[PDB]
Scaffold this active site. Sequence first.
Site, PDB file in Angstrom:
ATOM      1  N   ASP A   1      19.301  68.038  22.864  1.00 25.60           N
ATOM      2  CA  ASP A   1      18.939  66.852  22.062  1.00 25.60           C
ATOM      3  C   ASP A   1      19.741  66.821  20.750  1.00 25.60           C
ATOM      4  O   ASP A   1      20.915  67.210  20.733  1.00 25.60           O
ATOM      5  CB  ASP A   1      17.409  66.931  21.911  1.00 25.60           C
ATOM      6  CG  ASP A   1      16.711  65.613  21.749  1.00 25.60           C
ATOM      7  OD1 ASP A   1      15.896  65.165  22.574  1.00 25.60           O
ATOM      8  OD2 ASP A   1      16.962  64.984  20.706  1.00 25.60           O
TER       9      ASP A   1
ATOM     10  N   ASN B   1      13.744  53.876  28.618  1.00 29.29           N
ATOM     11  CA  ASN B   1      12.806  52.935  27.986  1.00 29.29           C
ATOM     12  C   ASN B   1      13.204  51.474  28.166  1.00 29.29           C
ATOM     13  O   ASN B   1      13.015  50.680  27.228  1.00 29.29           O
ATOM     14  CB  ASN B   1      12.724  53.323  26.506  1.00 29.29           C
ATOM     15  CG  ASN B   1      12.184  54.712  26.252  1.00 29.29           C
ATOM     16  OD1 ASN B   1      11.543  55.380  27.063  1.00 29.29           O
ATOM     17  ND2 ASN B   1      12.375  55.171  25.025  1.00 29.29           N
TER      18      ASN B   1
ATOM     19  N   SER C   1      11.070  59.733  26.141  1.00 27.25           N
ATOM     20  CA  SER C   1      11.495  60.962  25.440  1.00 27.25           C
ATOM     21  C   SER C   1      10.332  61.884  25.109  1.00 27.25           C
ATOM     22  O   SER C   1      10.513  63.114  24.978  1.00 27.25           O
ATOM     23  CB  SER C   1      12.173  60.606  24.120  1.00 27.25           C
ATOM     24  OG  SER C   1      13.547  60.311  24.380  1.00 27.25           O
TER      25      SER C   1
END
Length: 279
Positions: free
Chosen positions: A39, A161, A224
């Site tokens: 990340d 998303n 996430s």
Amino acid sequence: AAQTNAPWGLARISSTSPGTSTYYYDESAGQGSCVYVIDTGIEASHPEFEGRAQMVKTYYYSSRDGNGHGTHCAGTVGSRTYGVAKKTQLFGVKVLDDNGSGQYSTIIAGMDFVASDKNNRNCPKGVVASLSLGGGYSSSVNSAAARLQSSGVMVAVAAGNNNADARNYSPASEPSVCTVGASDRYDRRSSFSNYGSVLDIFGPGTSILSTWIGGSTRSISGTSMATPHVAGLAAYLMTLGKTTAASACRYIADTANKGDLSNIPFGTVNLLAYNNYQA
Ligand SMILES: [Ca+2]
Ligand SMILES: [Ca+2]
């Protein structure tokens, strides 16, 4: 063990029903397992990590999380207050810049790195990789994720998303990994959650409290946030000896709460991650 007044998503994963506030879990709590968070990095000095987190690789000028996203995800995997697997070891790989962006070639490199690096770590109970990232379909990205999984790492990835079919997104669309959609407090598919036949499982993803940079905390929403719940659950189950890296995604689907979610389009699984914990 039981955590009272827990964040709703931790309660949710240890319950058959929505609306409870206690997180019940075995005290083994993932000790002996390792989770790589790929990340923006991890603020390893955050008190909530208790010295269990460390940066292992950056692809940018610094190893610090200048964004917060990576720290939030890591916190859901294994922080003391906000984490599923409270005794797991966390390793940060910074593939995303402080704006939260990354090129596909650097995320691929970050995945190949984990496949190798795990061989120099003491992770007796197994290894997990949590990837709360993705973009448009890429066969090279998918292939990197498949390689990571095949090397013997439980790969969990965000569905995305876009309120769309995850087949058009990578690494979400790679069949061999564990693709995670998001749900809310009321057992509804999160309104932004991708769906489709490639999803393997849902976890909590709307209004998730976790660690943030500056030694703070913040509530944010996304697939996430759902992903680290499942990555933490896998770590938890591997240290209990219930499953292995190769079969953890199938095991969590087999043992999930079934048919509890609403707003699930035909053709998408109706399965919510559950730890099955029994006093
Ligand atoms: Ca139920
Ligand atoms: Ca899959």
